[PDB]
Design an enzyme around this catalytic site. Structure first.
Site, PDB file in Angstrom:
ATOM      1  N   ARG A 136      49.815  34.406  42.138  1.00 55.99           N
ATOM      2  CA  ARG A 136      50.806  33.382  42.452  1.00 55.99           C
ATOM      3  C   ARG A 136      51.617  33.026  41.211  1.00 55.99           C
ATOM      4  NH1 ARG A 136      52.592  33.746  46.717  1.00 55.99           N
ATOM      5  NH2 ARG A 136      53.384  31.579  46.710  1.00 55.99           N
ATOM      6  N   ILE A 137      50.931  32.740  40.105  1.00 53.23           N
ATOM      7  CA  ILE A 137      51.630  32.324  38.896  1.00 53.23           C
ATOM      8  C   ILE A 137      52.364  33.504  38.269  1.00 53.23           C
ATOM      9  CG2 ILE A 137      51.346  31.343  36.606  1.00 53.23           C
ATOM     10  CD1 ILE A 137      51.105  29.407  39.015  1.00 53.23           C
ATOM     11  N   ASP A 151      47.366  44.293  36.665  1.00 53.90           N
ATOM     12  CA  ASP A 151      46.639  43.658  37.756  1.00 53.90           C
ATOM     13  C   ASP A 151      45.582  44.635  38.262  1.00 53.90           C
ATOM     14  OD1 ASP A 151      45.940  42.341  40.332  1.00 53.90           O
ATOM     15  OD2 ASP A 151      47.600  41.010  39.784  1.00 53.90           O
ATOM     16  N   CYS A 169      48.825  22.536  36.116  1.00 52.22           N
ATOM     17  CA  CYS A 169      49.933  21.961  36.871  1.00 52.22           C
ATOM     18  C   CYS A 169      49.773  20.449  37.003  1.00 52.22           C
ATOM     19  CB  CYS A 169      50.031  22.623  38.251  1.00 52.22           C
ATOM     20  SG  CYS A 169      48.481  22.628  39.219  1.00 52.22           S
ATOM     21  N   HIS A 223      45.992  17.564  46.417  1.00 52.06           N
ATOM     22  CA  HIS A 223      46.410  18.863  45.926  1.00 52.06           C
ATOM     23  C   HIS A 223      46.451  19.892  47.049  1.00 52.06           C
ATOM     24  CE1 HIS A 223      46.699  22.358  43.275  1.00 52.06           C
ATOM     25  NE2 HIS A 223      46.862  21.534  42.256  1.00 52.06           N
ATOM     26  N   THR A 239      44.554  26.392  47.004  1.00 56.61           N
ATOM     27  CA  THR A 239      44.848  27.454  46.044  1.00 56.61           C
ATOM     28  C   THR A 239      43.983  28.681  46.329  1.00 56.61           C
ATOM     29  OG1 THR A 239      43.252  26.691  44.389  1.00 56.61           O
ATOM     30  CG2 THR A 239      45.470  25.723  44.308  1.00 56.61           C
ATOM     31  N   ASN A 296      53.135  22.753  42.520  1.00 49.35           N
ATOM     32  CA  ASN A 296      52.142  23.317  41.612  1.00 49.35           C
ATOM     33  C   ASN A 296      52.380  24.796  41.331  1.00 49.35           C
ATOM     34  OD1 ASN A 296      51.058  22.675  44.511  1.00 49.35           O
ATOM     35  ND2 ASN A 296      49.977  24.567  43.950  1.00 49.35           N
TER      36      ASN A 296
HETATM   37  N1  LIG Z   1      47.946  28.243  41.734  1.00 48.63           N
HETATM   38  C1  LIG Z   1      48.444  27.183  41.113  1.00 48.63           C
HETATM   39  O1  LIG Z   1      49.085  26.296  41.709  1.00 48.63           O
HETATM   40  C2  LIG Z   1      48.202  27.054  39.635  1.00 48.63           C
HETATM   41  C3  LIG Z   1      48.782  26.007  38.929  1.00 48.63           C
HETATM   42  C4  LIG Z   1      48.603  25.912  37.563  1.00 48.63           C
HETATM   43  C5  LIG Z   1      47.847  26.855  36.916  1.00 48.63           C
HETATM   44  N2  LIG Z   1      47.279  27.859  37.613  1.00 48.63           N
HETATM   45  C6  LIG Z   1      46.368  28.890  36.888  1.00 48.63           C
HETATM   46  O2  LIG Z   1      47.038  30.121  36.834  1.00 48.63           O
HETATM   47  C7  LIG Z   1      46.065  31.194  36.819  1.00 48.63           C
HETATM   48  C8  LIG Z   1      46.392  32.207  37.890  1.00 48.63           C
HETATM   49  O3  LIG Z   1      46.066  31.646  39.179  1.00 48.63           O
HETATM   50  P1  LIG Z   1      46.802  32.142  40.504  1.00 48.63           P
HETATM   51  O4  LIG Z   1      47.081  30.989  41.388  1.00 48.63           O
HETATM   52  O5  LIG Z   1      47.917  33.019  40.083  1.00 48.63           O
HETATM   53  O6  LIG Z   1      45.652  33.023  41.186  1.00 48.63           O
HETATM   54  P2  LIG Z   1      45.638  34.461  41.871  1.00 48.63           P
HETATM   55  O7  LIG Z   1      44.308  34.732  42.470  1.00 48.63           O
HETATM   56  O8  LIG Z   1      46.721  34.422  42.960  1.00 48.63           O
HETATM   57  O9  LIG Z   1      46.101  35.484  40.689  1.00 48.63           O
HETATM   58  C9  LIG Z   1      45.199  36.176  39.804  1.00 48.63           C
HETATM   59  C10 LIG Z   1      45.627  37.621  39.775  1.00 48.63           C
HETATM   60  O10 LIG Z   1      44.953  38.317  38.702  1.00 48.63           O
HETATM   61  C11 LIG Z   1      44.512  39.571  39.175  1.00 48.63           C
HETATM   62  N3  LIG Z   1      43.358  39.989  38.386  1.00 48.63           N
HETATM   63  C12 LIG Z   1      42.042  39.692  38.628  1.00 48.63           C
HETATM   64  N4  LIG Z   1      41.208  40.199  37.752  1.00 48.63           N
HETATM   65  C13 LIG Z   1      42.035  40.877  36.867  1.00 48.63           C
HETATM   66  C14 LIG Z   1      41.770  41.617  35.700  1.00 48.63           C
HETATM   67  N5  LIG Z   1      40.545  41.830  35.216  1.00 48.63           N
HETATM   68  N6  LIG Z   1      42.823  42.146  35.038  1.00 48.63           N
HETATM   69  C15 LIG Z   1      44.053  41.945  35.523  1.00 48.63           C
HETATM   70  N7  LIG Z   1      44.424  41.269  36.613  1.00 48.63           N
HETATM   71  C16 LIG Z   1      43.364  40.755  37.245  1.00 48.63           C
HETATM   72  C17 LIG Z   1      44.215  39.364  40.657  1.00 48.63           C
HETATM   73  O11 LIG Z   1      44.288  40.589  41.380  1.00 48.63           O
HETATM   74  C18 LIG Z   1      45.343  38.409  41.064  1.00 48.63           C
HETATM   75  O12 LIG Z   1      46.493  39.102  41.539  1.00 48.63           O
HETATM   76  C19 LIG Z   1      44.690  30.530  36.959  1.00 48.63           C
HETATM   77  O13 LIG Z   1      44.066  30.406  35.686  1.00 48.63           O
HETATM   78  C20 LIG Z   1      45.028  29.165  37.562  1.00 48.63           C
HETATM   79  O14 LIG Z   1      44.059  28.172  37.238  1.00 48.63           O
HETATM   80  C21 LIG Z   1      47.445  27.980  38.942  1.00 48.63           C
END
Ligand SMILES: NC(=O)c1ccc[n+]([C@@H]2O[C@H](COP(=O)([O-])OP(=O)(O)OC[C@H]3O[C@@H](n4cnc5c(N)ncnc54)[C@H](O)[C@@H]3O)[C@@H](O)[C@H]2O)c1
Ligand SMILES: NC(=O)c1ccc[n+]([C@@H]2O[C@H](COP(=O)([O-])OP(=O)(O)OC[C@H]3O[C@@H](n4cnc5c(N)ncnc54)[C@H](O)[C@@H]3O)[C@@H](O)[C@H]2O)c1
Ligand SMILES: NC(=O)c1ccc[n+]([C@@H]2O[C@H](COP(=O)([O-])OP(=O)(O)OC[C@H]3O[C@@H](n4cnc5c(N)ncnc54)[C@H](O)[C@@H]3O)[C@@H](O)[C@H]2O)c1
Ligand SMILES: NC(=O)c1ccc[n+]([C@@H]2O[C@H](COP(=O)([O-])OP(=O)(O)OC[C@H]3O[C@@H](n4cnc5c(N)ncnc54)[C@H](O)[C@@H]3O)[C@@H](O)[C@H]2O)c1
Ligand SMILES: [Cl-]
Lengths: 334, 334, 334, 333
Positions: free
Chosen positions: D11-12, D34, D151, D178, D181, D315
């Site tokens: 997502r991020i 990824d 966030c 919230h 997620t 977020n």
């Molecule tokens: N979702 C939100 O609203 C939000 C807000 C603020 C911060 N964050 C933070 O951002 C970060 C990402 O969260 P997200 O929402 O994108 O989750 P997500 O699950 O959607 O994204 C994580 C991605 O990383 C990939 N991945 C997993 N293991 C891996 C590896 N070993 N090497 C490379 N890629 C790998 C996964 O396939 C996935 O596509 C987290 O630390 C989260 O806490 C998220």
């Protein structure tokens, strides 16, 4: 003198199977539970269920076991398959419900670890006999050491297909299941290698998906081989699904005659497998219902004397778990 | 001489019709807006939309009008119909989108109040000509004073049905629409006199429902009279629906040839009505899509060379509102 | 002798009040049920419930009555109030649960139609004594002919506030309730004159809303007058809400001592009103729970020895309906 | 120009790339890492259930994300040490997998040749944490591993700074309602860290812990030990809201608070905070890029020192935009 089983994979199906075993006071004795997390967390998921309510308030986790009065079920957390102690526990049947050992070669590892039989709670690849209670389960042979209970959708379509087949014959059939979300889906858009669409947000989307149920009905009902195909839509409900069967029958008939045929089956040959209703039912009305296939009489439509669209509900969680318990009790008696 | 219209019922359809008129800079002039609430609340709902995002940030409500630069639309709040001043406003067409004047006798009251024509944004009872853009809209006669644009579901099924009819012929067709929730449904279980299931909690349930689309398609495509039937399932999504068409064609064909016929129609005879895609689409991908019928090539299945199950998406809000603007512009040009 | 009541408004609260009367075999006799639709549809809504499952399978609609074995409840469909036959039916208390007669002058019309008392299932305008079981219900006077049971939120906050007041004192309290969607909300964006935000799609949005619970608690607990304020967020769940109470106490204490105070109250003075849990509960775990306020011990946090944030759950449907029956039984005995 | 890579195309990770393109930033994304192939990642970048479709002319070709003339190399390495940041001229690794939040884990990107690492989450260890508009100018060029906080912290910290600078803060207790997620579950499943977080995400209001209140004490040291908080996960796919109960140090009115926040939104907090008096609901902020949108009509006042304040934030998009903002600030410093 009762049947000793273990549950490999304490998920939606694995936990509700244990629930249904307890709810009916079955002679089956659950000897061990294997999963990836500790028993205290599994006991929590067993006691609290967002869909089917709380259960066993006196159930407790103690000394690596699920304690329910004097019943004590050993908790395990082994992932190497070959390290499962089915020989020491005298395991008659492994309920294989992880979703990861659908191949026969994968399921055969339980036999190598000491299990006498394996029940895969899903469609299985390879030469694995597949049974649907009320359709072909009496074809079970004691020599079958690895068996399957088909899918929840097959357990809904096959009984209806058998009633139509035995009464009117089937020429062609095209099936759609409007299906509740399952654990393989995602809360937000994410990657799903096997089906890209299935990784899209489960509760934001109607998601088209493939299904093998129509072909599976051709296996337990060989007269229907090559006559059925289907598709699926995943929709934002947490449980309960519905089959939409468009069928061309072999003989001229009326929708009333179909209803009477299904109603008669539900009272006799399909007793406790099919249910017949004329109520204004919606999906949540079937949360907890144990039938494989609930014929929705008022929802169906007829185009002419041979083309119909028929509607059959099923709790894809509880109905399937109950069929697992039914199949286990049948195997013990044979 | 541009066309002067008014919007009776500033709901999902009424508001999105105004959005689409402005989004395309149509020569159509909206003279008045009638609803049950004051204009300040209606302006708020016009500017903010949970499904389709914010719109017209500079729009404001002043002196009983919706002010957008130099455009000023008079707000009304009359419910007795006979007190609407369509004669003084020189109304060419009343966009009837309240959902309450579907009978021709009720819609004729707008004519008595001074309107020259009435467009019912829903299926209508009585002798009301019904048009589907791209299917039979050229059959419009200037002498028709009360017309209908059918339902959103009919506007999705009819173009697909026409392409199948012209290329392969249709012997039988059985349609299911997995449909988003609409304003007639309820947040929690409540009474719905005409449709008991429809009062059950919209976001807890798969809800079976009847549909008039299959019969309506038989009217704008008379060769399909008596050949089509259908049903609906309401599911917990706020917008976007999908047609599931099981059809037996008159001549043998392949699934690839069906895809090629729809693809070619979307580029020619069905331009801006049908769209053809092979992408791994889910419902939210069509939020804001303006086509009546989006053929999902990867989702459909084939049983044999004459029996197929085809999948076609539609934004039941934006697609229908866009067709309303299209029909108005066509009526203006004739 | 026993109490004869009627239910005016057979909605979420009206139906669950009848359901709770039967589930406990209360001596209260329900003489008539009034709503806007016929008894066959009301019987359907009573027997099938998307949130709380099916109930009374042998219940039938016959001859304009709800027949349940030997109990027979007369169905009515009058809306003009002055035409309600409470004098002929010898009505002791009208359970006013339409949501439309919250003003005392409106509720007093039930007295003019022959009823001896009116119990408004909501906050009431005018000189209407308001009671929360376990907090101030013993202040009921037999001379009170029109009474209120406050809101579901007040019945959750008031018991917790009383325990905090009696044990530690309260200097300030600021409350937020994360509240389930209710029948006043909309499936898709629509107009709501009293509350613009509340008309936005109920299951697409976190929707801020005002609340009177904090002020209502200041009335049944006069020592808290002017010390509490509050707000609400409506979120896409069909039932069960939670109170988030930020409170600064008058004396220094620990979070453990607060937990012990609430737990002790739940076993004595607040028996069957408050419940105390340390489990990892989520909202669906409280579907069907009958307590007014369930203290979530592990969810709360402490900033220092006087400033805390406390969490209390409530099934806003079943908990409130149970308190209605509790209040009715108390009024009968006094 | 600045050369970055995205570790974790979730997502991020995807929306960060979307925001870089939406503003025509000079930042050049060199590689994307990824767990899945680029064709599936390209699909998830083009179609988004929450924020709509984007970049229709983008295609996956020759193991790259092709957008006109821009070509981003796709990678699918999980061993970290096998990432070729040394062969590439990588200035900053956007660490957005959610799995390398420890500094020891993030330091492995430096071992592979990267010059800096930006963890897109709260980080454990001695990792400098910055919130745009609050303390980002405390960034030191010597900082090789930095964090953008959460966030929720990016929503609470700007409001807290306006309250701190104008009226002072005695005590504060925060709740964030919230959105769901990716760490949550569609149906009841196991979650070792938070048992409640494994229960069906769209059937439940789910209590959860949060570190945002403590994190605000780091970027605003005057608030250390004055804030605590919790969270409720609720069935919406995006957009959250902060519910801040605060005791201010000086007597004031709710109007004075609104005017102070409104003034910050027009000056020191421009493009970070937004001030609104509209009848907003959560879906109105889908796509909004502000860190903190003050909801003037929703808040309530108990007395001249005790208030309950409401601030919205997307977020997903708000946080992704702050990532790009922080990167552009780091490039210029
Ligand atoms: N979702 C939100 O609203 C939000 C807000 C603020 C911060 N964050 C933070 O951002 C970060 C990402 O969260 P997200 O929402 O994108 O989750 P997500 O699950 O959607 O994204 C994580 C991605 O990383 C990939 N991945 C997993 N293991 C891996 C590896 N070993 N090497 C490379 N890629 C790998 C996964 O396939 C996935 O596509 C987290 O630390 C989260 O806490 C998220
Ligand atoms: N969910 C339904 O409605 C439904 C219906 C019919 C059939 N089925 C089938 O039942 C099976 C179980 O599905 P489910 O819905 O219970 O999913 P689930 O995700 O809820 O359960 C799987 C469980 O297995 C555990 N597990 C994972 N890997 C493991 C391993 N290596 N060893 C041991 N345990 C492991 C997981 O922790 C989890 O608790 C699947 O094959 C599914 O296709 C499901
Ligand atoms: N919603 C869809 O997807 C869709 C698709 C195709 C066709 N339609 C049809 O369009 C029509 C409008 O439906 P909708 O979805 O806009 O519903 P809606 O409830 O959102 O809109 C109806 C509006 O009319 C107003 N209204 C009610 N009574 C009125 C009166 N007497 N005078 C003036 N205004 C009045 C209501 O306040 C409301 O704003 C219906 O006939 C529906 O069947 C809807
Ligand atoms: N829903 C809750 O969780 C909850 C909790 C506490 C208190 N309450 C209060 O209880 C009351 C009832 O709310 P509800 O949730 O049952 O809503 P509801 O919409 O489900 O029930 C109201 C019922 O009254 C009927 N009705 C409407 N007008 C009528 C009339 N003139 N005469 C007779 N019947 C009429 C409607 O058909 C409907 O069945 C409201 O005042 C509400 O604030 C509700
Ligand atoms: Cl008596």
């Amino acid at each position: 003198h009762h049947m000793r089983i273990v549950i490999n994979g304490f998920g939606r199906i694995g936990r509700l199977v244990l629930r249904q075993i307890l709810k009916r006071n079955s002679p089956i004795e659950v000897v061990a539970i294997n999963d990836l997390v500790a028993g205290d967390l599994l006991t929590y998921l067993f006691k609290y269920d967002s869909t089917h309510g709380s259960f066993a308030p006196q159930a407790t986790f103690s000394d690596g076991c699920l304690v329910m009065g004097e019943r004590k079920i050993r908790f395990l957390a082994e992932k190497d398959v070959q390290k499962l102690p089915w020989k020491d526990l005298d395991v008659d049947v492994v309920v294989e419900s992880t979703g990861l050992f659908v191949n026969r070669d994968d399921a055969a590892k339980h036999l190598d670890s000491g299990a006498k039989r394996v029940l895969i709670t899903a469609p299985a690849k390879g030469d694995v006999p597949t049974f649907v209670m009320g359709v072909n389960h009496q074809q079970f042979d004691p020599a079958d050491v690895i068996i399957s209970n088909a899918s929840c959708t097959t357990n809904c379509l096959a009984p209806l297909a058998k009633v139509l087949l035995d009464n009117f014959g089937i020429e062609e059939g095209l099936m759609t299941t409007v299906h509740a979300a399952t654990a393989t889906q995602s809360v937000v858009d994410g990657p799903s290698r096997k089906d890209w669409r299935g990784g899209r947000g489960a509760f934001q989307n109607i998601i088209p998906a493939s299904t093998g149920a129509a072909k599976a009905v051709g296996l337990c009902l060989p007269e229907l081989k090559g006559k059925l195909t289907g598709m699926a839509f995943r929709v934002p409900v947490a449980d309960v699904s519905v089959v939409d069967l468009t069928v061309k029958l072999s003989s001229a008939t009326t929708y009333e005659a179909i209803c009477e045929a299904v109603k008669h089956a539900a009272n006799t040959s399909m007793k406790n497998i099919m249910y017949y209703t004329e109520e204004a039912v919606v999906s949540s009305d079937f949360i907890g219902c144990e039938y494989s296939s609930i014929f929705d009489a008022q929802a169906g439509v007829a185009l002419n004397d041979r083309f119909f669209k028929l509607v059959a509900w099923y709790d894809n969680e509880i109905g399937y778990a109950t069929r697992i318990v039914d199949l286990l009790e049948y195997v013990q008696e044979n």
